[PDB]
Amino acid sequence: TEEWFAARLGKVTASRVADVMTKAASRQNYMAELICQRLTGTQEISNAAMQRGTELEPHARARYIIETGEIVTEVGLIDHPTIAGFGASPDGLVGDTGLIEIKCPNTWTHIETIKTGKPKPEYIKQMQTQMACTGRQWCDFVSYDDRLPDDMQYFCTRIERDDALIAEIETEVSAFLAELEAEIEYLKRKAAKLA
Amino acid sequence: TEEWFAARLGKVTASRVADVMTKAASRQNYMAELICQRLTGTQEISNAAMQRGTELEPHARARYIIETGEIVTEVGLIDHPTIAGFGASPDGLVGDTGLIEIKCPNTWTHIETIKTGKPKPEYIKQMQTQMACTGRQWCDFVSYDDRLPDDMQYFCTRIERDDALIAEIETEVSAFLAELEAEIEYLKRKAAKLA
Amino acid sequence: TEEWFAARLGKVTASRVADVMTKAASRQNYMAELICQRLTGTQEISNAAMQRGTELEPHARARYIIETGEIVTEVGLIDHPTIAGFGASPDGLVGDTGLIEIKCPNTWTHIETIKTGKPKPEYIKQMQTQMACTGRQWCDFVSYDDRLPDDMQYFCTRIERDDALIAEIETEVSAFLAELEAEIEYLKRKAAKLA
Numbered sequence: 001t002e003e004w005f006a007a008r009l010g011k012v013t014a015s016r017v018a019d020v021m022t023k024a025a026s027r028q029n030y031m032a033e034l035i036c037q038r039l040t041g042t043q044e045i046s047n048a049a050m051q052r053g054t055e056l057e058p059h060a061r062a063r064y065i066i067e068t069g070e071i072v073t074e075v076g077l078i079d080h081p082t083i084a085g086f087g088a089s090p091d092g093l094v095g096d097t098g099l100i101e102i103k104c105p106n107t108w109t110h111i112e113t114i115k116t117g118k119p120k121p122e123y124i125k126q127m128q129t130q131m132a133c134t135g136r137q138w139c140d141f142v143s144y145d146d147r148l149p150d151d152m153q154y155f156c157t158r159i160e161r162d163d164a165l166i167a168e169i170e171t172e173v174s175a176f177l178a179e180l181e182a183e184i185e186y187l188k189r190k191a192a193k194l195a
Numbered sequence: 196t197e198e199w200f201a202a203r204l205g206k207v208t209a210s211r212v213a214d215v216m217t218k219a220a221s222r223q224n225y226m227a228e229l230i231c232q233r234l235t236g237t238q239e240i241s242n243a244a245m246q247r248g249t250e251l252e253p254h255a256r257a258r259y260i261i262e263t264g265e266i267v268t269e270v271g272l273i274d275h276p277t278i279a280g281f282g283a284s285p286d287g288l289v290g291d292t293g294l295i296e297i298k299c300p301n302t303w304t305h306i307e308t309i310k311t312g313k314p315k316p317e318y319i320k321q322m323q324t325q326m327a328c329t330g331r332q333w334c335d336f337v338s339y340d341d342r343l344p345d346d347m348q349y350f351c352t353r354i355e356r357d358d359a360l361i362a363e364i365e366t367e368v369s370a371f372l373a374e375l376e377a378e379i380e381y382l383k384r385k386a387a388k389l390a
Numbered sequence: 391t392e393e394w395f396a397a398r399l400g401k402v403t404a405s406r407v408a409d410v411m412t413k414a415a416s417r418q419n420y421m422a423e424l425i426c427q428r429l430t431g432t433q434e435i436s437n438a439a440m441q442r443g444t445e446l447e448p449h450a451r452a453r454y455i456i457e458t459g460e461i462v463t464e465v466g467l468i469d470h471p472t473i474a475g476f477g478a479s480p481d482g483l484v485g486d487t488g489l490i491e492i493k494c495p496n497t498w499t500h501i502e503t504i505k506t507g508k509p510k511p512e513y514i515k516q517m518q519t520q521m522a523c524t525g526r527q528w529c530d531f532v533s534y535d536d537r538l539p540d541d542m543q544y545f546c547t548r549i550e551r552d553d554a555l556i557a558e559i560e561t562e563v564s565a566f567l568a569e570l571e572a573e574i575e576y577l578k579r580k581a582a583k584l585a
């Protein structure tokens with residue numbers, strides 16, 4: 001929805017945390033995006049894999065509630081409690097202290113999740129960031145793909161909060177936000193004085 | 196046609212043999228595709244270069260028959276005689292012991308074929324694989340591009356069967372099929388027992 | 391317009407000069423294009439960044455005339471005075487001895503121009519090539535992006551003719567044209583004799 005797009009404008013967010021932290025181009029690329037979003041006052045604008053995976057998300061959500069019996073509340077963008085212009089959009093608030101994060105990737109990506117039993121470190125970061133913004137205690141990581149035989153369609157794993165990884169993330173994100181605002185500050189002053 | 200798409204589902208085929216054999220990512224990428232095709236029960240789904248080259252194929256076919264006078268029979272997917280789930284789709288059965296393989300690539304690719312007089316090793320593999328599935332003795336390799344001056348439009352070269360390259364191919368393909376089926380076997384057993 | 395497309399067919403042009411000169415694949419890639427254009431008798435055929443940047447070009451043109459008060463004449467393809475099949479399409483003839491060259495890139499590219507105050511060396515080459523075909527004395531390099539705050543939207547810098555860089559360019563371009571024509575010559579003779 002357009003509400004939340006506007007809440008997201010220019011903030012670092014859970015799913016881009018791996019880019020912020022990457023040992024790279026995807027960091028400065030991400031920075032540039034956010035600088036532009038802030039300066040221009042909007043975002044830019046998705047393959048049929050993404051589109052299809054979006055449709056399937058509610059199928060996953062339901063399968064999870066079937067599986068567990070949890071009460072899951074859909075939510076908006078949750079701003080970090082302390083770090084301003086930083087936030088998260090979890091797929092839902094599970095019970096009183098949990099979260100859900102749902103993937104509907106390509107069949108092959110799904111299979112590799114079944115194969116290894118573990119979410120990619122970039123998703124670990126994404127979830128840890130969610131827990132950090134929501135002060136929640138665990139996140140359930142669902143992967144779902146209905147094109148598969150029945151016992152391969154659904155996968156779930158819990159990832160417990162981790163205040164250590166969270167501590168790092170908060171630093172890096174704060175540092176990166178410092179850079180990003182000074183970079184904006186800087187251009188303004190050149191452009192300004194120059195005018 | 197959809198008939199042949201279904202005959203192709205999940206099999207290694209002549210034109211992907213270079214990927215199987217590559218000294219690489221394109222091998223495991225190909226493997227993943229075939230695993231998915233088998234497990235999901237279908238394929239995924241082409242630029243205007245491909246689309247255009249498909250239209251031009253019958254122009255090439257005719258030019259070849261004009262040039263040679265051969266009787267060429269269009270055929271479906273031809274399964275390897277011994278290696279199961281392996282096959283080939285030659286562009287036609289030329290006479291009693293020949294095949295045709297037709298390219299309508301970009302103008303520049305065509306010119307480089309005129310320039311060197313030889314088909315790319317990946318096409319050598321593709322044709323050798325055709326001869327292997329059809330027990331045919333040679334394949335005529337046509338390249339065609341009508342955007343060119345007249346004497347550059349059409350190129351043809353014969354490639355004789357080669358039971359040595361064919362021997363290798365059959366090994367690699369068999370090995371790769373072994374992997375691919377065990378990989379499927381494996382996931383089933385994890386998923387199964389896990390359910 | 392289609393007039394100028396036909397004037398451009400098969401010639402090296404100002405904006406592709408960096409490719410000709412590159413220390414690479416983009417050189418032979420460019421060569422192949424031009425060979426194909428000459429042999430086939432036409433060009434091949436752009437994202438929404440390009441499309442959008444094209445729309446904005448007249449906004450830039452006007453802003454420049456607002457800023458300076460110059461009389462700017464839009465022009466076609468200007469053929470090099472001596473080197474045949476070589477030419478330039480400047481964005482306009484400024485006054486009696488100037489040129490304009492207008493960019494409407496992505497916001498981030500624009501910002502990096504504000505940041506460094508200097509046009510990318512590939513644009514230096516492009517402008518020098520314009521001066522070389524027009525015998526003009528300077529080129530004004532405009533970058534424009536209206537999505538930005540007001541004092542960041544518009545940037546301008548002058549680049550004086552430079553007969554030294556121009557001398558180099560003319561060599562490289564002549565050399566590259568020699569190659570390109572002999573390459574065409576060559577294929578003809580193979581194809582010809584072969585027929």
Ligand SMILES: Nc1ncnc2c1ncn2[C@H]1C[C@H](O)[C@@H](COP(=O)(O)O)O1
Pocket residue numbers: 008013014015016077087088089090
């Ligand atoms: N533009 C757009 N439309 C729809 N879905 C999107 C879009 N961008 C990202 N996403 C998805 C991908 C992430 O899982 C989540 C953003 O979460 P966060 O924690 O806020 O990074 O939403």
Ligand SMILES: Nc1ncnc2c1ncn2[C@H]1C[C@H](O)[C@@H](COP(=O)(O)O)O1
Pocket residue numbers: 203208209210211272282283284285
């Ligand atoms: N999806 C699809 N549609 C149309 N044509 C295709 C498609 N995939 C491959 N091809 C072409 C490319 C190969 O020359 C041949 C497959 O031959 P084989 O020996 O079976 O690999 O058909």
Ligand SMILES: Nc1ncnc2c1ncn2[C@H]1C[C@H](O)[C@@H](COP(=O)(O)O)O1
Pocket residue numbers: 398403404405406467477478479480
């Ligand atoms: N196909 C097409 N349509 C519209 N605009 C184009 C096209 N190709 C290049 N350009 C733009 C990019 C260059 O600034 C200029 C060509 O200038 P020159 O000095 O001639 O290289 O025009």
Ligand SMILES: [Mg+2]
Pocket residue numbers: 091101102103
């Ligand atoms: Mg999700």
Ligand SMILES: [Mg+2]
Pocket residue numbers: 286296297298
């Ligand atoms: Mg073919």
Ligand SMILES: [Mg+2]
Pocket residue numbers: 481491492493
């Ligand atoms: Mg321009």
